Design a protein around this ligand. Structure first.
Ligand SMILES: [Zn+2]
Ligand SMILES: [Zn+2]
Ligand SMILES: [Zn+2]
Lengths: 45, 1431, 107, 286, 168
């Protein structure tokens, strides 16, 4: 019953990881970190 | 030992006795009295322990015999004890006779007519009258004087009847089975002797005694309730002189009973047994030779005896001088009685009194005296060094360095033939090889050659062979201790010597340069000896008796076939197997120079290898344009020169490990073909030469003998070495590659493996397939699998079964079809296919796929978080995440693939990190083939009437049923048996007359089974002696011959061939004198080195060693009839199953209201349609579990916790009946219309504190059975093994399966538990259950130990009609006292020997090493008698 | 022989050896359901005559007490009803030799 | 207890463990596993957890897994929901790596245990004491060195190389996939090709060599000391060989090794040497 | 021993004129058998032979820290292309000759330099010598010129052959 488009070089492959930092009231900060060229940035809301 | 100093007298028997006090006063040299050992000036004090009368001591002559330290044998002295003290070896039995005896008439309290009965039953058991002691019980104040006549007259009648009817000598008959009935009867005697209330002669009580342990004794207070019989008849530490003052008078009144209790053998000496024999008034000090200082601990224990002995003498001076002084001097003298007792306790037994080791603890365990210095000894003329591998040595030899050849020496007595080679040897001297280190003169002198120059040493070469100057030495001659030559013999030996082929006899061949022992490669398969710094012992025997045995009997060429299975264990290993794949190729062609160089490079006629005194060759394969010799023709003429001429070549048709698809299209190089001794086809492989049955070395063994076959491994070992040093062999990085085709094949099947881990996830968890990996329902259910070990095992086995199928698709395509370099040029692949070194799973993990790394039957373990590792997301359905690695050793494994492979690598190193074979070999050491062809124990008692039922040798039967091999070699086997030169001594015709009276009888029968067959005839083998009568063979050999010789029909006819297999059988008979019980028990312990029911070495632990009646996991096998269906089998399993009440309940809801505590136990079941299908539990049966079984257990648990907290008409009348039986149930109900629920109120008082009442219900429901057949837990219907329908249960109850006739074949119920088939089916069914269950422990591991070893281990364990273990509790029924004393608990068997006054005939091999006799098995099983010509 | 239902009184077991030489044998009715000699693991047991007991002891030069032992209480020597000291012959099936006759004695 | 558990990633070495009796019990750190040795800065962490939403433990009235408990070095700081307790556990990692906060040290171990069905007991267990086990790991938002413990590691996702970072699941990546191996384990060359029982024997047989113990042997009075005469630096070496100064201690020599069956004397395990090799000082030691 | 778990004792210091030799004239100072490799699977020893030989030619070292090679670029392709640019074989092999018969061997023999390690680890004899004082048996000990033990498992091996004068 348990059965029942990276701006520097140009490459669509670039890593990202989001964290909800301070509270649930704000937006999750969408971080971006590159592998092809190496430019990094973030985006909130 | 000197062979020219004989010995006239030999010990025949020994018998155990007790030193009386009169002897050791007359025996003694000088009594010693003061407890100081040696005073100043270095000289010992006279009168003390070190005394010059007890022996020479430190450059000072003996005061008894007047000899110095090198020649004084030592002498015993005695010390006087003022009170007779207890002997701690006998206090366990003195206190038995201290009790059980009335203190008034000084008889035992048991009645004298029945004490007379045991004295008449134990007299008959002294003789071989084990039967008539039971007839004595059938013989049944005035009539007791006549009953004791009728019992005593029958004993005297039955002795003189048996002694005149040639049955029992006046020395008595004493076998094992009368030692059983004797010990059982004396235990019967001592049991009911102690349990007595009053003496049955003078009817009153006696005060009971108390045992404080050792060192003391106490009597108890006689009760006021029963002192009145001590008046109508007309606590205290008692003395050791008060105990003897009873037991003297006890052992006088009852002399006629203890004359037969304390004697196993009939007492022809008529010595009266005494109570002084249990005390020891006088200690015996050992001689000063055996207690030299290291002071010594036995001088320290004897010091405290003598220190107390002068205190108690001075305390008795005041008793001669004498009320206040009398009170204190005697409560302090009595304090000295316990201390001088406690000293002689601690002298003998250190555990019965941190401490000083006593006399017993110098004997008991390993690192003792029997096991450390009698069964095993340090030896002279022996050596030890690391071995290094060596070709060019003739496979029966050892390579000894000059540092070994100079030290080790051998006594050669000089003769007429020695004095040319032994005069030159004694000139060379100690530091030249071959030399000599000493000369032993005629008169026993000894002249060391070390400090002698060449002029004196040549002078003694002429004094060497002189006539003797003395008449007393007129028949002796000088013995030159020469060096070891190249003709000597050696025992090589590597620990652990687990089987007898790990200690072989090699010839010697010195080497002139290098300092290590050197061993040929065909010996490493026997010693288990890789050359990674392993060292092994070298023993050099010192007389012609032992030289003739390590050359003929324990030779290394004799030991080709191991006796475990009969399979060969000698052969070539790594480079010789790879060279013979290259040499026997079709590509190998040799010119006239390369052909003749390979043949002489391996034959060398000047070293005695060929048989023709000229190397004969063959015509070449190709003649023109220029002659060439194929490599098949090398080994033809190699096998042509080592074979004996005027004997035809061998005919052999075999195959090898390499298929025909590795050679090409239409090759026939899988089968090998020897015809007329010529290799016409095939590759010689591991299967031909090597430890492989039915090769060419194994076929040269049978046809030409063990010496010709072992000469082939020398020649092939050099022919494959000279071929390697000119045509070499390498393995490189080129060998490990696949093509770009073959890599594309690999990376396309391995792309299937990504969805494999998820298809196996959804199948276990019973979701529908094609679900995503991030499904919230797949991730919800995979977490529940992780929390259970059992549910994770059925996820880690479904995923493992699927990725090991992706593994096999890679391997069965990418290799050999997609490997870049191919066979034979590929070499990583060649030495794996040929068995040279490596497997096919080893080249798979290099070139294709490393695979699912398996833990203990599982995948890689998981963390708490569901992650397998930090690199992977939690609970992912990836095959890579579980341990399945896609990398290989050629390209490389990822860092998370590497952490998983280091788990399985570590587990193999934990699973790597000797007593089963010890318990076996001690029981079975004397069991040998007799000259009746009837294997039996060393003391004469009989184990089997014939060895295995046919008495053929395991090492002589590998080609005995290979009939078509022998028909191809009829004219070659007829030369090695020569039947025309054996007719004059044997009876050819008579056993062949009886060979047809039983064969025609058996075919006419066998329409019926084996309970009807009046067989009318013995088999032809149990009536005629097969070693003497031709044609007296086993029944399987008689049938398999006449079945072979019936089917096919081929200058040898049909009747010249059956008259040769009947003579090949007779030479295959095992020799009288074979140490069978060692071989049978070395063939079980040594295959145990490579190791829902128990399995393996714990299964052998329960059968052999402990005789587990309470086995861990018993089972029972039930043959389903061929009439009932599979639906009538699994619904029959549901009728035999322990269905608990816990298995039927969904949930139990209690309800507790108070404010009389009101518990409402509402318990909820599954649907009535559902538990009447899964368990076949009916609705009305479930009510009768709650009505009568559940609640009475529940009521006995509610009250049990209270006792330990002090610290319609058919239902309303059913409800009133449950209240009436029970205690505090006020309401009861059950679901009758649907069977779904059950509710019953349960009141208490208010005094009771709060019970849990859910954890009670959880414990009572797990112990409440719905239905149960006893001793049976579960009945499983597996898949049919071997085509028969099998119904395995998980318990043993044979009676309750006899009712199930209509479903179960009750006359085929086999089991697993031997002590229950012994109880219900008798002795000979326990004997088959022991053979078959000691077989499937080896059948699992593919280890084929033959049934001849399993049959004797069976028939040894059932020799008493019981199921006896191989331990100290199963060897008590044994004649040999030194065997039991050498095993364990030495002084428990020593005191059982000496209380029984036990004489032993020195028959066991354990008792012939304690006393130094020759062993009665093998070579000492007969005498050698010289015929002298004159009168 | 004397087949009973459940139990004999232990004081009534004092009569089954009481009369010599007429032996009395004693069996359950629940134990006699399956004849154990029909089992596949038991061989053919045949008791030997006194004229064949001696010819056994003469050929192997044995004492009476050196043979392998069968008990008086195992259910095969209760089936045949063996008295103490008579040899039974065991026609035993082997894996390699087939039939070979072995012998046990009841002590 | 002798097993190679998966939680030992970067703290214990997989291969560097002896064979036989101490197997699994005696084992070695990774070469980047450093151990805490002084009490870290703690006294400003309860001040900046109350600013994140943690109610104080004086007036909270909560217990059990229905909340998560905030503990710093063993004492209850307060109670916060499982929702917010992961929010206030990701800032404490973001602010300890971006070291602008004056209260969070880099050496802190913030072990968050998420709520799960019958899993580990939940809570937020901050650790900062002595004697901890620490390894470096690279933190992907604002790439810097983060220092993590084993109690903290079993619930977070690191990647072994930045070509295997998967999006929204991987928080960290390792600096190199060789900081999990010990000293003796990095130094065996091409170790990802050998079978794993043959990597573990070289950690056993690399420290049973007649090498060079030191160079100050004149002022040493050791009872037994094995010194090989002419050591050589390897052709094929790891990059940690230069880094630890193992050129100061040469343990062997570059021999021209042929893989050939030629001799007959070298089959099972045994090998041979050129005779005129060690007439010239090959493998000589005192 | 190598750095790959491959230990082995010395059988014999084989003379130089009886050793194989390449076309370049070098003669190897260790011979390892090709059979130590399949059951052990130390393929990292084989790629040290490529990388060792290629680095002694170009005068360079190569790193061998693990996981610098993918499954695409096998180091047999990285170190084979360096051996091809030196005039040597791509697969690490070299043509060698027999030292005894002087013949061209069949396959090109796989050689190269690998780093070796010398490990750290016996030979007692006795004809006669000192005995014990309690039992008059030979003394335990190599340094005291004592004997070796024929124990209990060695005892019934001498029973097991049926040889009764070897046990005596
Ligand atoms: Zn980029
Ligand atoms: Zn003396
Ligand atoms: Zn009395």
């Amino acid at each position: 019953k348990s059965v029942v488009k990276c701006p520097q070089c140009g490459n669509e492959e670039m890593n990202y990881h989001t964290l909800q930092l301070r509270s649930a009231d704000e937006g999750a900060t969408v971080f971006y970190t590159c592998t092809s060229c190496g430019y990094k940035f973030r985006t909130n809301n | 030992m000197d062979i020219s100093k004989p010995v006239g007298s030999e010990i025949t028997s020994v018998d155990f006795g007790i030193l009386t006090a009169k002897e050791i006063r007359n025996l003694s040299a000088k009594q010693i009295t003061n407890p100081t050992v040696l005073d100043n000036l270095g000289h010992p004090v006279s009168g003390g322990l070190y005394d010059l009368a007890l022996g020479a001591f430190l450059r000072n002559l003996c005061s008894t015999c007047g000899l110095d330290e090198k020649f004084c044998p030592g002498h015993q002295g005695h010390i006087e004890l003022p009170v007779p003290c207890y002997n701690p070896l006998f206090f366990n039995q003195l206190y038995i006779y201290l009790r059980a005896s009335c203190l008034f008439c000084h008889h035992f309290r048991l009645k004298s007519v029945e004490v007379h009965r045991y004295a008449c039953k134990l007299r008959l058991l002294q003789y071989g009258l084990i039967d008539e002691s039971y007839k004595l019980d059938e013989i049944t104040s005035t009539l007791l004087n006549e009953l004791k006549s009728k019992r005593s007259e029958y004993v005297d009648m039955a002795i003189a009847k048996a002694l005149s009817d040639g049955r029992t000598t006046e020395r008595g008959s004493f076998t094992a089975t009368v030692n059983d009935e004797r010990k059982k009867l004396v235990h019967e005697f001592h049991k009911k002797l102690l349990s007595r209330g009053k003496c049955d002669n003078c009817g009153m009580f006696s005060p009971k005694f108390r045992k404080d342990g050792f060192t003391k004794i106490f009597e108890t207070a006689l009760n006021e309730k029963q002192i009145t019989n001590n008046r109508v008849k007309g606590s205290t530490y008692i003395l050791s002189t008060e105990v003897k003052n009873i037991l003297d008078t006890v052992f006088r009144k009852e002399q006629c009973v203890l004359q037969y209790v304390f004697h196993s053998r009939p007492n022809l000496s008529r010595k009266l047994v005494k109570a002084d024999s249990f005390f020891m008034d006088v200690l015996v000090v050992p001689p000063t030779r055996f207690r030299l200082p290291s002071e010594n601990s036995q001088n320290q224990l004897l010091s405290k005896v003598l220190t107390t002995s002068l205190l108690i003498r001075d305390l008795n001076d005041d008793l001669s001088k004498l009320l206040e002084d009398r009170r204190v001097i005697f409560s302090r003298l009595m304090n000295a009685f316990v201390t001088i007792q406690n000293d002689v306790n601690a002298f003998i037994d250190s555990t019965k009194a941190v401490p000083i080791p006593g006399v017993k603890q110098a004997l008991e365990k390993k690192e003792g005296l029997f096991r450390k210095h009698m069964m095993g000894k340090r030896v002279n003329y022996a050596a030890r060094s690391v071995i290094s591998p060596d070709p060019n040595i003739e496979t029966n030899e050892i390579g000894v360095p000059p540092v070994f050849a100079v030290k080790l020496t051998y006594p050669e007595p000089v003769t007429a033939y020695n004095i040319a080679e032994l005069r030159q040897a004694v000139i060379n001297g100690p530091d030249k090889w071959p030399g000599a280190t000493q000369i032993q003169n005629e008169d026993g002198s000894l002249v060391s050659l070390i400090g002698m120059s060449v002029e004196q040493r040549k002078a003694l070469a002429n004094q060497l062979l002189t006539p003797s100057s003395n008449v007393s030495t007129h028949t002796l001659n000088k013995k030159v201790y020469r060096h070891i030559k190249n003709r000597d013999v050696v025992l090589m030996n590597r620990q652990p010597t687990l089987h007898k082929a790990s200690m072989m006899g090699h010839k010697v061949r010195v080497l002139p340069n290098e300092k290590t022992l050197r061993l040929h490669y065909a010996n490493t398969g026997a010693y288990n000896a890789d050359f990674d710094g392993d060292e092994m012992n070298m023993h050099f025997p010192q007389n012609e008796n032992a030289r003739a045995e390590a050359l003929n009997l324990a030779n290394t060429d004799s030991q080709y076939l191991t006796p475990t299975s009969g399979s060969p264990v000698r052969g070539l290993i790594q480079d010789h197997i790879s060279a013979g794949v290259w040499l026997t190729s079709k590509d190998s062609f040799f010119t006239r120079e390369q052909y003749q160089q390979y043949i002489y490079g391996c034959i060398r006629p000047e070293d005695g290898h060929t048989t023709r005194s000229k190397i004969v060759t063959l015509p070449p394969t190709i003649f023109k344009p220029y002659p060439l010799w194929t490599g098949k023709q090398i080994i033809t003429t190699v096998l042509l020169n080592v074979t004996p001429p005027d004997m035809p070549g061998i005919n052999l048709i075999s195959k090898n490990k390499i298929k025909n698809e590795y050679w090409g299209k239409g090759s026939l190089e899988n089968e090998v073909l020897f015809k007329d001794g010529a290799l016409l086809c095939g590759i010689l492989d591991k299967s031909q030469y090597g430890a492989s049955k039915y090769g060419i070395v194994h076929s040269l063994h049978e046809v030409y003998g063990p010496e010709v076959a072992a000469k082939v491994l020398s020649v092939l070992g050099r022919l494959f070495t000279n071929y390697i040093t000119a045509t070499a062999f390498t393995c490189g990085m080129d060998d490990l590659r696949l093509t770009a085709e073959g890599n594309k094949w690999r990376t396309d099947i391995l792309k299937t493996s990504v969805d494999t881990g998820r298809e196996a996830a959804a199948e276990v968890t019973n979701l529908d397939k094609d679900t995503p990996a991030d499904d919230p329902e797949l991730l919800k259910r995979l977490q529940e699998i992780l929390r259970d070990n059992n549910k994770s095992g059925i996820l880690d086995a479904v995923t493992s079964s699927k990725v090991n199928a992706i593994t096999s698709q890679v391997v069965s395509k990418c290799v050999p079809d997609g490997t870049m370099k191919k066979f034979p040029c590929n070499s990583m692949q060649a030495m794996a296919l040929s068995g040279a070194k490596g497997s096919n799973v080893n080249v798979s993990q290099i070139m294709c796929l490393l695979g699912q790394q398996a833990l203990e039957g599982r995948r890689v373990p998981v963390m708490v978080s569901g992650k397998t590792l930090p690199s992977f997301k939690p609970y992912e359905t990836d095959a890579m995440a579980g341990g399945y690695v896609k990398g290989r050793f050629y390209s490389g494994i990822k860092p998370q693939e590497y952490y998983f492979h280091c788990m399985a690598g570590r587990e193999g190193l934990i699973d790597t990190a000797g007593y089963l074979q010890r318990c076996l070999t001690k029981q079975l050491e004397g069991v040998h083939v007799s000259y009746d062809n009837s294997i039996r124990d060393a003391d004469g008692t009989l184990v089997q009437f014939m060895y295995g039922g046919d008495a053929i040798d395991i090492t002589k039967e590998s080609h005995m049923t290979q009939f078509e091999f022998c028909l191809d070699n009829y004219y070659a086997l007829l030369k090695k048996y020569n039947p025309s030169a054996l007719i004059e001594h044997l009876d050819v015709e008579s056993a062949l007359k009886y060979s047809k009276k039983t064969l025609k009888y058996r075919k006419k029968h066998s329409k019926e089974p084996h309970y009807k067959q009046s067989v009318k005839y013995d088999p032809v083998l149990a009536k005629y002696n097969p070693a003497k009568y031709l044609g007296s063979v086993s029944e399987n050999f008689q049938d398999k011959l006449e079945s072979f010789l019936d089917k096919n029909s081929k200058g040898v006819n049909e009747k010249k061939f059956r008259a040769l297999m009947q003579l090949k059988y007779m030479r295959s008979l095992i020799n009288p004198g074979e140490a069978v019980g060692i071989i049978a028990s070395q063939s079980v312990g040594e295959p145990s080195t490579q190791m829902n029911v128990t399995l393996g070495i714990p299964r052998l632990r329960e059968i052999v060693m402990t005789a587990s009646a309470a086995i861990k996991t018993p089972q029972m096998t039930l043959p389903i009839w061929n009439d009932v269906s599979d639906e009538q089998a699994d619904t029959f399993c549901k009728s035999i199953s322990k269905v608990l009440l816990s298995e039927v309940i969904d949930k139990v809801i209690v309800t507790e209201t108070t404010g009389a505590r009101s518990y409402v136990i509402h318990m909820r079941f599954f649907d009535n349609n559902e538990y009447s299908e899964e368990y076949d539990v009916s609705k009305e049966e479930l009510q009768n579990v709650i009505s009568n079984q559940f609640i009475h257990l529940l009521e006995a648990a509610i009250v049990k916790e209270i006792k330990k907290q002090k610290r319609n008409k058919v239902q309303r009348d059913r409800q009133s009946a449950i209240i009436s039986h029970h205690r505090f149930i006020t309401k009861y109900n059950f679901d009758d219309e649907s069977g779904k629920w059950c509710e019953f109120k349960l009141e208490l008082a208010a005094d009771t504190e709060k019970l849990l009442m859910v954890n009670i219900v959880e414990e009572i429901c797990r112990k409440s059975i719905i239905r149960q057949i006893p001793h049976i837990d579960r009945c499983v219907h597996p898949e049919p093994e071997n085509g028969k329908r099998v119904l395995v249960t998980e318990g043993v109850n044979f009676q309750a399966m006899w009712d199930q006739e209509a479903f179960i074949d009750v006359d085929g119920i086999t089991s697993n538990d031997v002590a229950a088939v012994l109880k219900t089916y008798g002795v000979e069914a326990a004997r088959n259950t022991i053979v078959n269950e000691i077989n499937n422990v080896f059948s699992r591991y593919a280890i084929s130990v033959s049934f001849r070893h399993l049959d004797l281990i069976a028939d040894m364990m059932t020799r008493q009609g019981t199921y006896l273990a191989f331990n100290r509790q199963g060897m008590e029924t044994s004649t040999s006292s030194f065997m039991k004393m050498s095993y364990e608990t030495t002084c428990q068997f020593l005191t059982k020997a000496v209380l029984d006054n036990e004489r032993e005939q020195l028959d066991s091999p354990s008792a012939r090493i304690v006393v130094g006799k020759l062993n009665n098995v093998g070579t000492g099983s007969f005498d050698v008698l010289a015929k002298v010509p004159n009168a | 022989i004397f087949v009973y239902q459940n139990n004999i009184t232990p004081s009534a077991m004092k009569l089954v050896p009481s009369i010599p030489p007429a032996t009395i044998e004693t069996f359950n009715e629940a134990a006699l359901v399956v004849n154990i000699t029909h089992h596949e693991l038991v061989p053919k047991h045949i008791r030997l005559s006194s004229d064949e007991k001696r010819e056994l002891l003469k050929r192997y030069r044995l004492k009476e007490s050196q043979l392998p032992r069968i008990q008086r209480a195992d259910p095969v020597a209760l089936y045949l009803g063996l008295k103490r000291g008579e040899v039974v012959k065991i026609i035993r099936k082997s894996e390699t030799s087939g039939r070979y006759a072995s012998y046990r004695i009841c002590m | 207890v002798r097993k190679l558990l998966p939680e030992s990633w970067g703290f214990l070495c997989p291969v560097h463990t002896p064979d036989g009796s101490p197997c699994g019990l005696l084992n070695h750190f990774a070469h980047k596993c450093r151990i805490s040795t002084q009490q870290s800065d703690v006294s400003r962490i309860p001040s900046i957890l109350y600013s994140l939403g943690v109610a104080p433990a004086s007036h909270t009235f909560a217990a059990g897994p229905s909340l998560c408990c905030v503990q710093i070095d063993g004492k209850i700081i307060g109670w916060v929901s499982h929702e917010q307790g992961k929010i206030i556990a990701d800032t404490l990692r973001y602010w300890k790596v971006e070291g602008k906060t004056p209260g969070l040290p880099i050496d802190l171990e913030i072990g968050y245990v998420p709520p799960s069905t019958r899993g580990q007991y939940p809570g937020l267990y901050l650790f900062g004491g002595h004697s901890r086990m620490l390894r470096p790991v690279r933190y992907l938002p604002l790439d810097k060195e983060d220092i993590v413990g084993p109690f903290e590691q079993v619930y977070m996702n690191i990647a072994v190389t930045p070509q295997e970072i998967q999006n929204n699941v991987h928080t960290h990546v390792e600096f190199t996939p060789t900081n999990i191996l010990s000293i003796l384990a990095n130094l065996t060359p091409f170790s990802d090709f050998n079978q794993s029982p043959r990597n573990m024997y070289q950690c056993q047989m690399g420290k049973q060599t007649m090498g060079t113990p030191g160079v100050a042997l004149c002022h040493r009075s050791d009872n037994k000391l094995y010194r090989l005469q002419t050591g050589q630096t390897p052709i094929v070496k790891a990059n940690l060989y230069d880094d630890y100064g193992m050129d100061n201690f040469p343990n062997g020599f570059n021999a021209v090794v042929a893989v050939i069956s030629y001799t007959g004397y070298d089959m099972d395990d045994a090998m041979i040497i050129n005779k005129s090799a060690d007439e010239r000082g090959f493998g000589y030691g005192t | 021993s190598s750095r790959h778990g491959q230990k082995g004792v010395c059988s014999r210091k084989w003379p130089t004129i009886d050793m194989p030799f390449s076309e370049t004239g070098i003669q190897p100072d260790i011979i390892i058998n090709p059979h130590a490799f399949p059951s052990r699977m130390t393929i990292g020893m084989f790629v040290e032979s490529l990388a060792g030989k290629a680095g002694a030619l170009h005068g360079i070292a190569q790193d061998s820290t693990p996981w610098i090679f993918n499954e695409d670029d096998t180091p047999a392709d990285y170190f084979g292309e360096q051996l091809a640019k030196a005039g040597y074989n791509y697969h690490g092999n070299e043509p060698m000759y027999s030292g005894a018969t002087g013949e061209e061997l069949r396959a090109d023999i796989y050689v190269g330099v690998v780093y070796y390690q010398r490990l750290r680890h016996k030979f007692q004899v006795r004809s006669t010598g000192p005995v014990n004082s309690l039992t008059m048996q030979p003394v335990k000990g190599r340094k005291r010129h004592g004997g070796i033990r024929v124990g209990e498992m060695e005892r019934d091996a001498l029973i097991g052959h049926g040889t009764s004068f070897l046990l005596q």
